[PDB]
Design an enzyme around this catalytic site. Structure first.
Site, PDB file in Angstrom:
ATOM      1  N   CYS A   9       1.254  -0.969  -0.304  1.00 57.68           N
ATOM      2  CA  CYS A   9      -0.071   0.332   0.464  1.00 57.68           C
ATOM      3  C   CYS A   9       0.726   1.302  -0.157  1.00 57.68           C
ATOM      4  O   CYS A   9       0.629   1.795   0.810  1.00 57.68           O
ATOM      5  CB  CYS A   9      -1.259   0.149   1.107  1.00 57.68           C
ATOM      6  N   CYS A  62      -5.604   1.694  -4.759  1.00 57.03           N
ATOM      7  CA  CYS A  62      -5.175   2.459  -3.836  1.00 57.03           C
ATOM      8  C   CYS A  62      -6.961   3.760  -3.718  1.00 57.03           C
ATOM      9  O   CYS A  62      -6.433   4.820  -3.829  1.00 57.03           O
ATOM     10  CB  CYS A  62      -4.120   3.055  -3.504  1.00 57.03           C
TER      11      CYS A  62
END
Ligand SMILES: Cc1cc2nc3c(=O)[nH]c(=O)nc-3n(C[C@H](O)[C@H](O)[C@H](O)COP(=O)(O)OP(=O)(O)OC[C@H]3O[C@@H](n4cnc5c(N)ncnc54)[C@H](O)[C@@H]3O)c2cc1C
Ligand SMILES: Cc1cc2nc3c(=O)[nH]c(=O)nc-3n(C[C@H](O)[C@H](O)[C@H](O)COP(=O)(O)OP(=O)(O)OC[C@H]3O[C@@H](n4cnc5c(N)ncnc54)[C@H](O)[C@@H]3O)c2cc1C
Ligand SMILES: COC1=C(OC)C(=O)C(CC=C(C)C)=C(C)C1=O
Ligand SMILES: COC1=C(OC)C(=O)C(CC=C(C)C)=C(C)C1=O
Ligand SMILES: COC1=C(OC)C(=O)C(CC=C(C)C)=C(C)C1=O
Ligand SMILES: COC1=C(OC)C(=O)C(CC=C(C)C)=C(C)C1=O
Ligand SMILES: [S]
Ligand SMILES: [S]
Lengths: 407, 405
Positions: free
Chosen positions: A161, A339
């Site tokens: 991430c 994301c």
């Protein structure tokens, strides 16, 4: 030797998801998961836990309660892979052979590569949303922040991430404004990278936020040391080797350097870098045809997210079924990843992209805008669909939604 | 078992540092852990693969470069426990130390390329990076009749970033010398987006590339050798999932490279597996009695023997002042050198520092191909290596650079 038709290494997002999928394909008794942790975590919610908006406890379930029922849970660490012999070792001095191997070992956190960590986390004013042990310390540092530098880092390694190290920066900024101490915070993002985000559309959108909210981003600055007792951080300038900088912080969020799991680093199944060496389209291992990889542990050149895991699990399900029929896989992974860039307590920029690092947005609207709908989706819908759908193997990414929304 | 200074690796950095440390703590207080019965001066392997030097001259018994009195522990380090100031070997010994120098070099990973190293048992394929394969480069040069001559560069850090390219220039010259240049399609498939990291030498090589009708395909990474079918598979790093199967008449493989396996998971490694050292002093960032030199380190400069020499100068002073409870003041500048062999009689001597800016020793422009630099590379440097550097008397050419100015 203990033997399973389908052996899954890692009981995380990828490993449980593929275990559920493989349970339906070969029968639960032919599937085992090797996983040492008693607890399975929905890690994306740690962003909101570090920002005080969600509870740590809600982010985890017992590993036993996410094991697809009837699948064997080998509670142990993989300590070696011998793919030439179709077997692995565990830290219970057991060997397990397999007919098919799914490697889902995730990415390893190396806090200890920062001088002063993880010992430094015993002190106030420093957290990290990346560890169950430290994400609540992020939140406490955010609460106890009176005045000074609020420093958010991004290491010189691959990362799961890539947005989470700045999600918590936007959340911290919003919290400072909510509690009237924005004036007293100098908010700094020292990232090892040369850009704020790797996809142009969303990088521009984040750039507007950085300007608009008086954020400082220092590029090619990498945290190398924490002196937590003195509330000091040492950053190296990657553009000028040898040059370092000691900066005081009132709050430090550390994104740890990350690396392939140690057991994968030296394994024949890894590429030279340590990542599971798979076909970038089918997720079949390039050298061991009964080996597959999914998620953070692989060398798939896309961002390491659970969303990518979901899309990957749909591809890998097809790949393994085709390999079992001794046919050639035809369904290709496109590098889909996502994301959900939390830019405040009620806004998300939903970055979705593929291998080309070009937008591949699910929804007909422009996701580069900070959206309430996307915040709600990330904070409340996605955990539910994770536990009740993804982990059961019924979620392979939102591509069908994207194609259904383009009618 | 205990040594004041334990040196891991009996390669270029290890022997160099053992020689220097012998002079500082006494031979009886230094040990070298090194499994190989032979020590190689690897830079000449470029010329061995081009047939212009001989493999035998590249190597000497490790025993003959171990500084006298320094204990040679013939074993592999299998674990490093710096919190306990000791290492483990594959003889199941613990060896403790007061100070640790890690000079384990870089690891070659041919087996990360599907088909290698088995495919080396077949003709038409060599690699200058391995003593097992550099002569196979030369035979592939000789046996070349017609087709593609393919030279690769992997998607990893490497030692001597110029060598994969050097043997391409030598191969081109060999094809012109033997009249078969017309029949050779000479391709450099590099994982990188640039031919070289220093613009001055990049542009010099660019001219040579255009002038000699060399092809450079950027972001193309060797992933598979089908040596029996003489096919090389490349992945397009600009378009994931896309590959390309190319036929070759000669394939020179620069293998993927990585930190030695024992360092990859060790506490002394950074997250990527390189020895995590101070970039100016070469003292380990987290273990003050650990030091690193050479390819195994995370020093952000080209991984070359020249860099090792300059680092051995700095690391010598670093360890001396640490042993004297002093603070280090002498700072490594990232000096490195790539003697870019561009022909059987010419070298572009790239010298540069951490800034990737030229840092040339000689007063003339070294981006020109020069016979003087070829002669230096092919005949002087091996002599200085064996008889000066490995004895601790070569710390790079910085004094030469300053005496020439
Ligand atoms: C703070 C944070 C925020 C995030 N936010 C988002 C987000 O908004 N959106 C998104 O899509 N993703 C997000 N993610 C990423 C997401 O959590 C991961 O990409 C996803 O978990 C990857 O799945 P995985 O199965 O590869 O790894 P994991 O889910 O981490 O599972 C790996 C498993 O392997 C196990 N394992 C490790 N070593 C061994 C061994 N030697 N033997 C056996 N088992 C082993 C581990 O215990 C772990 O259970 C975030 C991550 C973090 C840390
Ligand atoms: C083809 C080629 C051409 C080159 N040309 C040039 C050139 O023109 N100029 C230049 O400056 N450099 C050049 N180099 C680079 C130079 O050879 C290296 O950078 C130099 O050898 C680095 O020294 P080192 O001591 O770090 O590693 P090495 O010299 O490789 O030695 C490392 C040592 O560690 C030992 N070792 C490994 N694992 C273990 C273990 N587990 N336990 C114990 N010991 C272990 C190995 O046996 C080896 O002896 C070239 C290299 C190659 C391959
Ligand atoms: C140093 O931190 C900052 C940046 O990172 C380099 C910016 O990009 C930007 C945006 C750049 C300009 C020139 C307005 C600002 C304002 C800033 O403060
Ligand atoms: C929680 O992890 C995530 C996924 O896996 C469950 C997704 O599919 C997606 C993409 C989902 C939609 C509905 C576009 C996102 C954004 C995500 O964060
Ligand atoms: C709800 O169940 C699902 C499907 O069935 C309708 C899909 O086709 C797909 C997507 C599959 C393709 C081939 C786009 C996903 C991701 C899914 O979760
Ligand atoms: C053998 O490897 C090499 C060195 O280590 C001994 C050097 O010092 C140097 C630099 C030496 C001079 C005199 C410029 C080069 C070019 C080299 O290739
Ligand atoms: S993410
Ligand atoms: S080199």
């Amino acid at each position: 030797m203990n033997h399973y038709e389908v052996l899954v290494l890692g009981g995380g997002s990828g490993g449980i998801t593929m275990a559920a999928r493989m349970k339906r394909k070969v029968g639960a008794e032919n599937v085992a998961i090797v996983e040492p942790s008693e607890r399975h975590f929905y890690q994306p919610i740690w962003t909101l836990v570090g920002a005080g908006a969600k509870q740590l406890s809600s982010s985890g379930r017992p590993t036993a309660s996410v094991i697809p029922s009837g699948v064997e849970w080998i509670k142990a660490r993989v300590t070696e892979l011998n793919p030439d012999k179709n077997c692995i070792h565990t830290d219970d001095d057991e060997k397990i052979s397999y007919r098919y191997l799914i490697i889902a070992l995730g990415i390893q956190l190396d806090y200890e590569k920062i001088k002063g960590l993880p010992e430094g986390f015993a002190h106030p004013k420093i957290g990290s949303n990346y560890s169950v042990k430290t994400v609540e310390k992020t939140w406490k540092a955010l609460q106890d922040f009176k005045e000074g530098n609020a420093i958010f880092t991004f290491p010189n390694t691959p990362v799961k991430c890539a947005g989470a190290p700045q999600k918590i920066m936007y959340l911290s900024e919003a919290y400072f404004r909510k509690t009237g101490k924005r004036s007293k915070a100098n908010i700094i993002f020292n990232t090892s990278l040369g850009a704020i985000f790797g996809v142009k559309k969303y990088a521009d959108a984040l750039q507007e936020i950085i300007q608009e909210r008086n954020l400082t981003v220092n590029y090619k600055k990498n945290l190398i040391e924490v002196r937590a007792d003195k509330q000091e951080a040492v950053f190296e300038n990657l553009d000028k080797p040898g040059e370092t900088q000691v900066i005081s912080y009132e709050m430090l969020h550390v994104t740890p350097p990350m690396s392939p799991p140690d057991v994968l680093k030296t394994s024949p199944v890894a590429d030279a870098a340590g990542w599971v060496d798979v076909d970038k389209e089918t997720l079949q291992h390039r050298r061991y045809p009964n080996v597959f990889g999914i998620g953070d542990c692989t060398n798939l050149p896309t961002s390491k997210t659970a969303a990518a895991v979901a899309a990957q699990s749909g591809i890998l399900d097809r790949t393994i079924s085709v390999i079992m029929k001794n046919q050639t896989p035809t369904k290709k992974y496109d590098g889909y990843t996502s994301c959900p860039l939390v830019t405040g307590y009620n806004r998300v920029i939903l970055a979705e992209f593929d291998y080309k690092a070009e937008p591949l947005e699910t929804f007909p609207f422009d996701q580069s805008k900070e959206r309430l709908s996307m915040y709600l989706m990330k904070a409340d819908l996605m955990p539910f669909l994770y536990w009740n759908m993804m982990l059961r193997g019924y979620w392979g990414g939102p591509a069908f939604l994207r194609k259904l929304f383009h009618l």
